[PDB]
Amino acid sequence: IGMEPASLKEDVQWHLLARMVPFVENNYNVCELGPRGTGKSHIYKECSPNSILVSGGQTTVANLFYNMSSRRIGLVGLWDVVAFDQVAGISFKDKDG
DNA sequence: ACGCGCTACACTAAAAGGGCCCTTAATTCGATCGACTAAGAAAGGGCCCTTTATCGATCGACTG
Numbered sequence: 599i600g601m602e603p604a605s606l607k608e609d610v611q612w613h614l615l616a617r618m619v620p621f622v623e624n625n626y627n628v629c630e631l632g633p634r635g636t637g638k639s640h641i642y643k644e645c646s647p648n649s650i651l652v653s654g655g656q657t658t659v660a661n662l663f664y665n666m667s668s669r670r671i672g673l674v675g676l677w678d679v680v681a682f683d684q685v686a687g688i689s690f691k692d693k694d695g
Numbered sequence: 696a697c698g699c700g701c702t703a704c705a706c707t708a709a710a711a712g713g714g715c716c717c718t719t720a721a722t723t724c725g726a727t728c729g730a731c732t733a734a735g736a737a738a739g740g741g742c743c744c745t746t747t748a749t750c751g752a753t754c755g756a757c758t759g
Binding site for chain 2: 658660665666667691692
């Protein structure tokens with residue numbers, strides 16, 4: 599990732615590995631809450647070309663799961679990791695979300 | 696092997712998504728204007744009490 603392992607505690611290293619875990623296991627839902635500036639969104643935005651960081655919380659079942667008009671599957675179809683930032687900000691215009 | 700079948704453009708209709716925007720029916724309040732709720736009000740009014748008259752009763756000089 600670019601972190602210095604010798605400058606971190608062992609448990610912090612294992613937490614960072616848990617952060618890797620969503621990339622390596624199929625259909626792995628995981629939630630992480632923490633203080634600002636702890637380097638959360640960096641791994642899901644820079645250090646992987648096959649993961650997406652959904653910003654702003656602007657998520658609808660149309661573009662996230664299945665858009666019935668265009669008949670194309672949403673984000674969850676071609677990305678290995680979908681990371682919802684700003685969990686407070688995520689809200690669904692449709693109820694079914 | 697040059698006429699022939701495919702591959703490109705506007706109107707009409709249907710679906711769905713997504714702003715979305717108005718609604719509303721929930722909220723706050725926030726005066727507020729009654730609404731009492733005492734606190735002291737003052738007029739008024741009501742109450743009391745010592746005033747004169749008299750009716751004895753008597754106790755007086757005075758008096759014959």
